[PDB]
Amino acid sequence: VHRDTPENNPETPFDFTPENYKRIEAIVKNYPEGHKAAAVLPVLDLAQRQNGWLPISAMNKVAEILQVPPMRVYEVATFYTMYNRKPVGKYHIQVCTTTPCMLRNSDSILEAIQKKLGIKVGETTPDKLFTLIEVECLGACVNAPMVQINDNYYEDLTPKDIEEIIDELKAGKIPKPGPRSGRFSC
Amino acid sequence: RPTVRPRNDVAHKQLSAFGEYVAEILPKYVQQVQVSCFNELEICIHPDGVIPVLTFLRDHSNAQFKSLADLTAVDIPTRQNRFEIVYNLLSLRFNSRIRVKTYTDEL
Amino acid sequence: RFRGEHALRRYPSGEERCIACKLCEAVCPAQAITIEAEPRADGSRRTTRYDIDMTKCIYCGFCQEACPVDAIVEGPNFEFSTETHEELLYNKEKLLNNGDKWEAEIAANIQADYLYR
Amino acid sequence: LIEVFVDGQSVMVEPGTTVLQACEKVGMQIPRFCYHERLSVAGNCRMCLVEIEKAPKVVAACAMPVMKGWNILTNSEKTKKAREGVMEFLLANHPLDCPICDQGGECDLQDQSMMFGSDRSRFLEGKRAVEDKNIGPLVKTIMTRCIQCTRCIRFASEIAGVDDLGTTGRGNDMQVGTYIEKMFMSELSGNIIDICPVGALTXXXXXXXXXXXXXXXXXXXXXXXXXXXXXXXX
Amino acid sequence: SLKDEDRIFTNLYGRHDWRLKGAQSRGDWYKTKEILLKGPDWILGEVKTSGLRGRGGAGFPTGLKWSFMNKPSDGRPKYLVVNADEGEPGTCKDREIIRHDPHKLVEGCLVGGRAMGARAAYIYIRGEFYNEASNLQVAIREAYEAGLIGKNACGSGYDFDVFVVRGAGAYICGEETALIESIEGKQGKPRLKPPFPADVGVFGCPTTVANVETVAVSPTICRRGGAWFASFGRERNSGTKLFNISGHVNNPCTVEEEMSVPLKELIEKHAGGVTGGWDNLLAVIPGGSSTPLIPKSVCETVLMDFDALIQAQTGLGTAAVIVMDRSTDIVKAIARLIEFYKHESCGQCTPCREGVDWMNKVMARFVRGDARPAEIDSLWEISKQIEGHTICALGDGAAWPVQGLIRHFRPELEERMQQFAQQHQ
Amino acid sequence: XXXXXXXXXXXXXXXXXXXXXXXXXXXXXXXXXXXXXXXXXXXXXXXXXXXXXXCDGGGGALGHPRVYINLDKETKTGTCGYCGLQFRQ
Amino acid sequence: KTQPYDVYDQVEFDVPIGSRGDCYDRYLCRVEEMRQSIRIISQCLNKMPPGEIKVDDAKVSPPKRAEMKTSMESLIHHFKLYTEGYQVPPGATYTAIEAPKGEFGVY
């Protein structure tokens, strides 16, 4: 699903940030003063960070602040892949499956994570804690496996190291960069 | 091409010699326009003399047609001159098909 | 494969096979077939007016060939004799749909028609 | 005004004139999908590709202007190899509606396959289908028949006023619909069905009533609404 | 004539210890006041005299591209554009040029600011790489407040302000026309390239598109001598570019190397899987995702330079090694590369939305083995066609690797079809 | 269903107070059996596994051009252009 | 013998020509045509290459019924070869193929 939007219990109810409203207005000033539609691309990323799972009515309220077309601003977030579509948990992680990562085994890291953290691949956790989704590329391809959770991307993980990092993340943040070898040259 | 083309042009240059030969006489009374396409020859004739064109091709040393067999006419309202009587001629000794047309309105 | 009196076929689970295109209308060299289409109740859009003249029609099988859904299939028919033109020219489907008595033969004949002979 | 020869014949054109606009002066119509009359110039199909006298890559007629005195051929060897190819790409993911489809002969895509595209075969297996978009009174819209172009997208933004149509996905899943469930406004948006080349947007009031084949056309000015003239009635 | 690898020479060396002041001791903003005092014509001439090729996956020279705008007379104020997000998979330049040393990337906008003549500089980062984007935002706060760039800094009349914006993470950072449309606010789709480039009109302004590695090389080329950048490499293409190896390898690591370097020597230094080209079957690609895979026979003769790489099969543009072992599948690997373009297709040009999606569906059948032996030759005609009749360069990027299946290989593809023909049918 | 005397078939009117119809008096008028399209709804809906399903009457033998039908909305099942057959999930 | 239509001269033909222009000799040649016609039919049975029935190019002849139902371009061409005609090249052409009565000079 990409085009269709549900009308039941996620169409009318929406909330906007009040404390971050002053910070959102300053973000619009960073671009051009006259004719500013660039703020809509920045506010869409700020809305997902402040409130989990962006509503259809929430995008219309964000478009009203910058004063833009409601249909055009809704289409702007549809093309983006980083923005949330339906629902996201407390810490959502996306796994890379592209050929630069698949050459040194990437599917083995995803299959081990699927059995340890439950569910198939597309389905999220029923208690809402971890959500799995297939990603194109994480960005940094220096390490053989790559997975980006929430904001900080975790790189370089073994078959048992990936399962140990996932279970520990339930209570306390695990930080990390490439916990397998030197960062620059090894 | 194997199925796309019907026949390659080889006799087209040979039939073009007739497009020169009759035109070498060069009458404003007879010749006017000579069109040749798809192994066939087409001539249109000035209304003043049609009989002298038909006595030609009949007998003649270079080409022997004789049979002035099939005779058609074209109705077209686009031009200022309306009708176009079209003669279809066939040779038995020479084995060729030539066309004689009239350009006049012929009301 | 033999062409006689016209009869329009239907699907095995009800439903009229004719979809209303005006495809067979334009191909028809006699212009015997007439078609005016309206939406059927709700959703479906399949025919309203469907007259084939027997005063016209030179029997080609062109309407059989032009049909993408295979509605008009020419059945082995000989028996047709009337007192008037009115009784002879076919009405809005109905008598064409009454070709069920020949549709059992048509279903057998079309099995020799798919991948031609 | 700078003159540049197209198909050997010379034609005078303006300095900021388009390639397809220059082709009209030479009495030749290139294969189109994105308008040239009133709708804004945009790519997003690459059908109107034409090859220059000395160029490695073909340029689109809607975007690229003539500018300098360069020779461009419409019946070139590279153009015919292009036109047959693009048609196959358009029909690899096309739902096959032709007998059921509201248009038939009036469809611009239907003619271009007969005139330009490859006839003998089309290599395709498995076509994706899109869900039906919501529409009010006029135009019974079907998203499957749509080729996903930019014609009606810019029509709502510029010509009609109120914007609704846009993009929904990324790959072969992007719909031309409104995304949010809302009926289209009246004003002048009833003419959107006549704009679209494919049989996707067509008037619901006169749907499947009569095909383009066998209909006598006559031009007459409309009585309802003032300043209305030239309207063809079948 | 022969090029040596690095040998105490690097564009960006600081990666272990760098914040703001620590980088300054190890060559950063050394001639900041000197470059600002110099004229715009003289500063632009320094890049043209060196002859540095474009770091981004295109092949176009950086000297000609920066001079293409020039700006003789401008009505609307000019703006500077820079791309830092990851485009092609297998590239490590995105999380190294900005993540490790953020001070070097910020200095690149200031060096090209006075040269091009832009009022404000803008940078686009990947949405997935949020940790790397935070380092770039922290560097801007340490530069604007202290007095590095903005209004009047380091004895300069021209004003330049740096601002970083988070991206969607698709083809919006890919094409040069796409970056202008994404930053403006509109949906992720590239503008028409034939009539107007970046110089004529980009977000209502004259602009220029620059890569993350291309922009970072500009202050290093300005501070040091012009001959130093042209010393390593070939006559046509010169300048050190960051190459990253990913896939089947003993140790995967990204390291800076000199131009016109052999593929056998570069793989041996980083250590690959089994053998460099004796025991393990060679399936390495010179590019990240754009260029098709190189043959097993021709690999030692191939060079890192773009001018030398064009002679054999296809030129390297992205400059990233994607080596695959003999045990690893070849058919399934290249099919996944096309599947990347299936998701990263924007939705404009009809031989790409309904093209690549058609291409991936046929390619998925080759893994199973249901495809006919005749279908291999037919697919080659379609693959060549997409390269020519597309607006953006991603249409070419999906077209090239499919051409590398018919070329070089072919018995490998035929064996998969023949195996399922006897077993199932 | 029949109005007065004549039976309606595939949406048809007989006569307004008997004026037009006069020929069908001595001879019995034709009527198509089950022309109300009751057999269309009588057929059971088939379950789908994929997001898009291809429809066919009975291969190349029976006249049915291939159309792909999308299934995205839970309410109202999707049907092909040629058949009255509906698909869910 | 003079003008081939569809694979001629390859098939052996025998043409009966009499002497007198009377009704009896003009009848004998027709019976002699009939006895020397089976030679052609037998040679037609001898030479039959298996292949295409219609022209493969779908701008002239409608495609196969199994073909049109699946592929796209086939049905659109099926929609336009019917209703609409052929879109013929302009020009005047004359053809005559031997009728047993005489000729069919279609113009």
Ligand SMILES: Cc1cc2nc3c(=O)[nH]c(=O)nc-3n(C[C@H](O)[C@H](O)[C@H](O)COP(=O)(O)O)c2cc1C
């Ligand atoms: C598939 C693909 C992805 C690309 N991704 C990027 C990218 O993420 N960043 C970038 O700077 N250039 C990228 N490029 C190169 C662009 O063509 C670039 O905008 C420009 O033309 C190269 O010049 P530059 O090195 O001055 O940026 C990509 C090219 C292709 C074909």
Ligand code: SF4
């Ligand atoms: S008989 Fe066939 S071609 Fe004619 S309208 Fe009905 S479905 Fe269409």
Ligand code: SF4
């Ligand atoms: S058989 Fe020929 S004349 Fe008769 S209805 Fe069909 S197309 Fe028309």
Ligand code: SF4
């Ligand atoms: S859109 Fe045109 S080509 Fe496609 S099915 Fe409808 S009429 Fe045929």
Ligand code: SF4
């Ligand atoms: S509905 Fe028509 S005009 Fe609109 S995008 Fe689709 S094909 Fe183009």
Ligand code: SF4
């Ligand atoms: S080639 Fe593909 S990705 Fe590039 S602009 Fe065209 S449709 Fe979009």
Ligand code: FES
């Ligand atoms: S018709 Fe010119 S780009 Fe679509």
Ligand code: FES
């Ligand atoms: S390809 Fe996996 S992180 Fe880039």
Ligand SMILES: [Zn+2]
């Ligand atoms: Zn069906």
